[PDB]
Amino acid sequence: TIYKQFTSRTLLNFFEVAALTDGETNESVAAVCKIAAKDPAIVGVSVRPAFVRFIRQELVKSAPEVAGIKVCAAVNFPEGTGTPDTVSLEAVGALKDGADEIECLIDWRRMNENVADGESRIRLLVSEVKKVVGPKTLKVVLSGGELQGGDIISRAAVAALEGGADFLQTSSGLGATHATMFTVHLISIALREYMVRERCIGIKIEVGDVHMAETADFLMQMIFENGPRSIVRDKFRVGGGFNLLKELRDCYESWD
């Protein structure tokens, strides 16, 4: 239908595809980047810092179109257990290698031990990394390998904002835990309240391996919580998998 075609075209405009698994190779990363970069190009691709120079120095000769998508380097992945100094170094290297953005996973496990200490660590990590990112975008990933309660997510969100996050990202893309209506609601509340007490701050809804229909509901959630004006690249991104990206393209390509 026209409605599915319009929804898929809109989703493509905000989409960021992940190529973050333990088993990625240059070949698997290249395949993902090629589909990301086909006109109309999506926003970007997320990879571990290892792959940035392959994409930016080598793949571009094979597939020049990849120059037209952003590369977002996933630092402190997959465990979130590095120190501010080491994660800052990862980010420095990623930016040198050609990354356009950084996504930084927090030490989410610390929130299970001592919330106050966990919040302190988030503020330090995020503020440290923001110093090396300069005016580029720093997305802070609030969840990793396990499901944590709403109160923890809310407190992680606030700490990340206080530390200087340019974007709050629901989830890493690894494991089984991704955005839910509940966590998108809590993250939206945290951001809304931070802006009232108060820069342009976004929300990235990372949906895992779900299909277009479920992804579309998150789009609707975002507009309901944060208004139509939030549906712009500086304030919104959708993170998903390769199969979801292929579904979106198949749908859009059916429009005459």
- Cα gap 200→137, rounded to integer Å: 10
Choice between 149 and 227, CB closer to Cl ion: 227
Task: With CB under 5 A as the rule, give the number of residues binding Cl ion.
Answer: 8
By CB under 8 A, tell whether 216 contacts a second copy. yes
- Residues 73-92 close enough to bind a second copy by CB under 8 A: none
By CB under 8 A, tell whether 199 contacts a second copy. no
Residue 134 Cα to chain centre, angstroms:
18
Piece of 4-12, 74-82, 148-156, 236-244 that binds a second copy (CB under 8 A) = 4-12
By CB under 8 A, tell whether 182 contacts a second copy. no
| 99, 73 contact by CB (below 8 A) | yes
3-state secondary structure of 74: strand
By CB under 8 A, tell whether 219 contacts a second copy. yes
By CB under 5 A, tell whether 61 contacts Cl ion. no
Please identify which residue in 6, 21, 58, 79 interacts with a second copy, judged by CB under 8 A.
Answer: 6
Choice between 26 and 254, CB closer to a second copy: 254
CB of 204 to Cl ion, least distance (A): 14
Please identify which residue in 25, 195, 213, 250 interacts with a second copy, judged by CB under 8 A.
Answer: 213
- Cα gap 178→99, rounded to integer Å: 24
By CB under 8 A, tell whether 223 contacts a second copy. yes
By CB under 8 A, tell whether 220 contacts a second copy. yes
| 48, 58 contact by CB (below 8 A) | no
By CB under 8 A, tell whether 1 contacts a second copy. yes
Residue 24 tokens, joined: 């990625």
- Cα gap 230→168, rounded to integer Å: 13
Backbone angles phi, psi at 117, to 5 degrees: -70, -40
The set of residues, in sequence order, having a beta carbon less than 8 Å from that of 253 and lying 6+ positions away, is none
Cα torsion 176, 21, 152, 103: sign: negative
| Partner interacting with residue 246 (select from a second copy, Cl ion, none; CB below 5-8 Å by kind) | none
Overall residue count recorded for the chain in this entry: 256
CB of 243 to a second copy, least distance (A): 19
By CB under 5 A, tell whether 228 contacts Cl ion. yes
By CB under 8 A, tell whether 147 contacts a second copy. no
- Gap between the terminal Cα atoms of the chain: 11
Backbone angles phi, psi at 185, to 5 degrees: -65, -50
Q: Which residues bind a second copy (CB under 8 A)?
A: 1-7, 9-10, 13, 40, 213, 216-217, 219-220, 223-224, 228-229, 232-233, 255
Interface ranges with Cl ion (CB under 5 A): 1, 3, 40, 227-229, 232-233
